[PDB]
Design a protein around this nucleic acid. Structure first.
Lengths: 247, 247
DNA sequence: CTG
DNA sequence: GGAG
DNA sequence: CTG
DNA sequence: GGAG
């Protein structure tokens, strides 16, 4: 099966990802920015107990670490959501290079009607943050019944950060550049963590999907085995139904 | 004085006006209009007693007459104000030929710095309405303590009617056409019932004003002696102060 | 009265 | 959601 | 939590 | 007068 042949490529069997070829990202600030420290709004016990196992898993994975930072933004009430709006305002803008899906799909021709669709799991967390940029994303974490109050921050590209989709898309494009060169017959559409491979034949789509999974796993990315649509003639991609070259 | 020399021209001494050269006006309706009869809102005694002497004076003057009409619009609460909006909607539009005052004043040159300003009193009432058009403007009048309920209507161009300013301005232009031809040295600006005469010299402004008053009174119009600004170098006209050729 |  |  |  |  596909699950057995590519254990490294699937999130189910490959462990948390880590894009080993990508340098840790430095996040430039705007020219006039200084740190902003926003007080953590008090959180109910119900919310805290709901968030806690998530925080602990991230700590165990090294995705969160303790820190002392002049930056602080609040966590909101369950899985944790950080309000990074005041950090986002202080970070230098980058050009938005992620194509809109309508335009991305224009590049899909009718000669290629066999499709594989993969979505990468925990995509942003596969990209490391440079230690100089980690303090930007700090938040407070209290455990009233263990006696630890202090800050944590992210060692990977965080959710809620305005440049994460663009930085991830650019990184994955660098990492898949050689795959494209080695498989010029195939069409590969990338939309952040949502990937479509298109081929002429069921076989060429199988061999290409095998190459792509091998490549993704080797690079440190992980795809959802549960959601994968492998070597079909009909797939859902980016909210479209792809059938008969339509849509 | 000016009051003594031109008794016919002034409202104070000449009686109510009546533009004797102007045919009674016929008011064309829109192609699809039919009569509208709006019920008179009950009026308080205080309002009725306030309006009554005005109605009686207009009846005495023949400006109001009794009628039976399929049209009816309400009087509002003191001097009477008729709500003619539903009649206005059913009357055919005419081109708006009254110039805006800014443009009207552009036609005043600096060579003419002696001014006379007259305003005509009860201007619209000087124009007769054709009997076929009189029923359009009917309203109800009750006297609870004399026992008369029935309609009245106007025999003259009414207040509140959307075409009155334009029809009056056009009529007065016809009536003053010959004056302009006989006095080509003078500037005469007309804005509905507000008239400015401009001359080169105090004398020429006096002789022109004498001619204009004689002409206006003869035609049946009446000017306010109280408000007249006669042969001055400074006047207020149409909300401007005219001084030194300025404004 | 019905920005 | 001051006009007549 | 801050048309 | 739904965003993070």
């Amino acid at each position: 099966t596909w699950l057995s042949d590519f254990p490294q490529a699937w999130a189910e069997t490959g462990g948390m990802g880590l894009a080993v070829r990508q340098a840790p990202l430095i996040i430039p600030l705007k020219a006039t920015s200084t740190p902003v420290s926003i007080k953590q709004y008090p959180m109910s016990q119900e919310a805290r107990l709901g968030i806690k196992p998530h925080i602990q898993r991230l700590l165990d994975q090294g995705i969160l670490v303790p820190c002392q930072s002049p930056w602080n933004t609040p966590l909101l009430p369950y899985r944790p959501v950080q309000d990074l709006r005041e950090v986002n305002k202080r970070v230098e803008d980058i050009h938005p290079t992620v194509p809109n899906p309508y335009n991305l799909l224009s590049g899909l021709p009718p000669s290629h009607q066999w499709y594989t669709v993969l979505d990468l799991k925990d995509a942003f967390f596969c990209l490391r943050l440079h230690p100089t940029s980690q303090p930007l994303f700090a938040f407070e974490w209290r455990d009233p019944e263990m006696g630890i109050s202090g800050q944590l921050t992210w060692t990977r590209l965080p959710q809620g950060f305005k440049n994460s989709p663009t930085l991830f898309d650019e990184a994955l494009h660098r990492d898949l550049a050689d795959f494209r060169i080695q498989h010029p017959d195939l069409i590969l559409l990338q939309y952040v963590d949502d990937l479509l491979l298109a081929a002429t034949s069921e076989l060429d789509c199988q061999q290409g999907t095998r190459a792509l999974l091998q490549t993704l796993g080797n690079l440190g990315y992980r795809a959802s085995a549960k959601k994968a649509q492998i070597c079909q003639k009909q797939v859902k991609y980016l909210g479209y139904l792809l059938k008969e070259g339509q849509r």
